[PDB]
Design a protein around this ligand. Structure first.
Ligand SMILES: [Cl-]
Length: 327
């Protein structure tokens, strides 16, 4: 049956990260599913998750590892260690995938089938001290990736050579990256922070053409905002993101709407996702980064459907959609 995974960062150096699994049909959530199925802790700061042919890959940022589990039993089928500080994983094939990192100038290349690191992609003009590669989107034989922490550019990678072939400098610290149905990528910066050794400025939302790798639209916000998590709906024509409130806009719009999708409620909207089949929007609220977090489920029209408590600091989602795998 269809379901939704929710990773929970937990607290840094507290090794209290956990995995939750929610059933939209029953409105029931199960917490600490990884530990309950495996007998050992997920780790420190679970960061993201992807599902590929009956296998879920969970990135645990501060545990230097990626866990491969059965999406039904949640039991571990394999794992890859040795990562500096893993962020996201993007599959190119059953034997090749990229794993971005923070505190590293290299993008780790791995072989999912053998569960080992096979190589590295060196990013130009960055080191280990402040290096950072985050989310990735694929465009034909190319893969685009945003450089977040103490960085200000998007890199273009040729998957046929595993090398960076181009770059684009934009606002400081782009946080995420998605591709719409017009082959236009979207990224939103967080503008750094006050007293930052790198910079502090008003953040912006960018619309960049994938083919020409050029900025087409730039929507600048207010100084002090720390936006993040650009997300798209199933048809990839409605963009959502976080900036105090949960915002949304048609990808063809010439301006950001004056009203948000979900108003700020003095808490801490941290994670976000949209059901690719029905458009329902799920918002992960960290509350205060201390107590147990909560997830809100809204209809496309913005009606509250359900809410459920998960783990500490829920920040990422992964949909488990039913479908027949190829043989
Ligand atoms: Cl768990």
């Amino acid at each position: 049956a269809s379901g939704l995974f929710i990773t929970n960062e937990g607290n840094f150096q507290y090794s209290n990260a956990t995995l939750s699994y929610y059933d939209p049909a029953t409105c029931e959530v199960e917490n600490e599913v990884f530990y309950r199925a495996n007998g050992f802790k997920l780790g420190d700061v679970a960061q993201s998750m992807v599902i590929r042919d009956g296998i879920g890959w969970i990135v645990v940022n501060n545990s230097h590892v990626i866990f491969a589990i059965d999406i039904n039993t949640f039991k571990e089928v394999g794992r890859i260690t040795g990562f500096t500080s893993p962020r996201y994983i993007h599959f190119l094939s059953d034997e090749k995938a990229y794993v971005t990192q923070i505190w590293d100038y290299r993008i780790f290349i791995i072989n999912p089938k053998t569960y080992e690191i096979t190589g590295y992609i060196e990013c130009p003009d960055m080191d280990m001290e402040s290096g950072s590669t985050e989310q990735m989107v694929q465009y034909g034989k190319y893969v685009y990736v945003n450089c977040w922490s103490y960085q200000n550019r998007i890199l273009k990678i040729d998957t046929e050579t595993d090398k960076v072939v181009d770059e684009l400098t934009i606002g400081i610290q782009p946080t995420s990256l998605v591709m719409d149905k017009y082959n236009k990528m979207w990224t939103i910066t967080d503008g750094g922070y006050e007293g930052s050794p790198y910079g502090y400025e008003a953040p912006s939302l960018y619309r960049i053409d994938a083919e020409t790798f050029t900025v087409e639209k730039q929507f600048k916000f207010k100084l002090g905002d720390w936006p993040s998590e650009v997300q798209l709906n199933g048809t990839r024509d409605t963009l959502y993101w976080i900036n105090n409130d949960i915002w949304r806009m048609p990808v063809e719009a010439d301006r950001v709407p004056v009203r948000p999708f979900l108003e700020f409620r003095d808490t801490k909207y941290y994670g976000l996702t949209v059901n690719p089949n029905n458009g329902e929007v799920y918002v992960a609220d960290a509350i205060d980064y201390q107590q147990q977090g909560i997830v809100y489920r809204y209809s496309p029209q913005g009606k509250l459907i359900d809410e459920f408590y998960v783990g500490i600091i829920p920040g990422a989602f992964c949909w488990k959609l039913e479908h027949h795998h190829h043989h």
